[PDB]
Amino acid sequence: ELPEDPRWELPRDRLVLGKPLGEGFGQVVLAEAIGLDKDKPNRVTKVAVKMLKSDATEKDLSDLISEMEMMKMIGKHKNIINLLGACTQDGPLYVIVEYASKGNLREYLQARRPPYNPSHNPEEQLSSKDLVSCAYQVARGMEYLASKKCIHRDLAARNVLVTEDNVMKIADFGLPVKWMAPEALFDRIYTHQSDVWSFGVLLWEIFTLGGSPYPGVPVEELFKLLKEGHRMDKPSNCTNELYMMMRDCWHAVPSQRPTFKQLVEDLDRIVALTSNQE
């Protein structure tokens, strides 16, 4: 069996398992942790828990362990989904991570489109400042992952989660062609620079309020078209400046893309210059 790590161990009975959140190497459930903070033991905290499926394999387990251990090393950032604890000893492995009550960014955005809005439960409109700040937080998250030499490989709005307080958090960073840099797509060369390409696509999702990239373009055609220099059009409601940022992220030459460091700086300044009422 798996060895205990007292830095992260939480007794199994301090965890009240709640409702399925869906599949996410196994299944994720919502739960309540009692006394997650040892110096405040009568408090319940809403958390998310990952566990293996009933018909799951040895590969599924080893991958679940690696993910956890990887998260331990990467450490804490407010704009990633953080590790909170684990139950490793009294039965099935449970990995406990922060809970994002508002779901993933793509659906968060789509639901906040004016009357195509596929939600029968629409939500309140997002200002332009909200959209840029959303981009900024995602950049801050990636900046941190890049500084810890963590290469995401599948950055996209669907892999950003949104907390109750609308804090953006990178998901599944410790483990689709339409978000991949050409060099990733052609030669399986993933770098921080290719994540920067993926971020440009994510920027485009933000400012189309969760649009499908390259709509109607077949997957088999896309690489050719990208080699030809095809790039998505500017979203109807997006500043030229923000579009230029998209375009730089999609530089054919990977060395010529901005870094997440620089993107955070640029976005920081654009947020300050965007008012609450624009």
The three state secondary structure string of 191-242 is: CHHHHHHHHHHHHHHHHCCCCCCCCCCCHHHHHHHHHCCCCCCCCCCCCHHH
Q: Is 80 left (phi over 0), alpha (psi -120 to 50) or beta?
A: beta
The rounded distance, in Å, linking the Cα atoms of 29 and 19 is 6
Residue carrying structure tokens 């490989």: 153
Of 5, 39, 130, 154, the active-site residue reads 154
Give burial (CB, 10 Å; 0-12/13-18/19+) of 242: buried
**How many residues are present in the chain?**
278
Identify the experimental approach: X-ray
The tokens of 41 are what?
């033991």
- What φ, ψ does residue 105 adopt, rounded to 5°? -60, -40
E strands along the chain, which residues?
15-23, 27-34, 44-51, 83-87, 94-98, 160-162, 168-170
79 marked among binding-site residues:
no
- What φ, ψ does residue 91 adopt, rounded to 5°? 140, -140
Residue carrying structure tokens 């993926």: 198
User: Does the annotation count 154 as an active-site position?
Assistant: yes
Partners of 16 in beta bridges = 32
The rounded distance, in Å, linking the Cα atoms of 137 and 157 is 12
Long-range contacts, stretch 126-129, CB < 8 angstroms, 24+ apart: 126/209, 127/276, 127/277, 127/278, 128/274, 128/278, 129/271, 129/274, 129/275, 129/276, 129/278
Helix (H) or strand (E) holding 137: helix 128-147
The rounded distance, in Å, linking the Cα atoms of 80 and 167 is 10
216 marked among binding-site residues:
no
Amino acid at 131: L
User: Strands across the sheet with 94-98, in order?
Assistant: 15-23, 27-34, 44-51, 94-98, 83-87
Q: Find out whether 246 and 122 touch, Cβ atoms under 8 Å.
A: no
Residue carrying structure tokens 């991958």: 63
**From residue 256, how far is each of 20, 101, 192, 226, 247 by CA, in Å?**
43, 37, 12, 16, 11
155 marked among binding-site residues:
no
The rounded distance, in Å, linking the Cα atoms of 32 and 46 is 5
Q: Find out whether 121 and 111 touch, Cβ atoms under 8 Å.
A: yes
Total Cβ atoms within 10 A of residue 136: 20
The rounded distance, in Å, linking the Cα atoms of 21 and 49 is 9
100 marked among binding-site residues:
yes
The rounded distance, in Å, linking the Cα atoms of 196 and 246 is 10
The DSSP output letter for 121 is: S
The tokens of 196 are what?
């920067």
Which domains does the chain show, CATH number per domain? Answer: 1-99 (3.30.200.20), 100-269 (1.10.510.10)
121 marked among binding-site residues:
no
Q: Maximum Cα–Cα distance for the chain, whole Å?
A: 61
Partners of 48 in beta bridges = 30, 97
Give the pairing of strands 160-162 and 94-98: unpaired
Give burial (CB, 10 Å; 0-12/13-18/19+) of 39: exposed
The rounded distance, in Å, linking the Cα atoms of 213 and 208 is 9
Q: Find out whether 117 and 108 touch, Cβ atoms under 8 Å.
A: no
Helix (H) or strand (E) holding 144: helix 128-147
Total Cβ atoms within 10 A of residue 85: 21
Q: Find out whether 141 and 77 touch, Cβ atoms under 8 Å.
A: yes
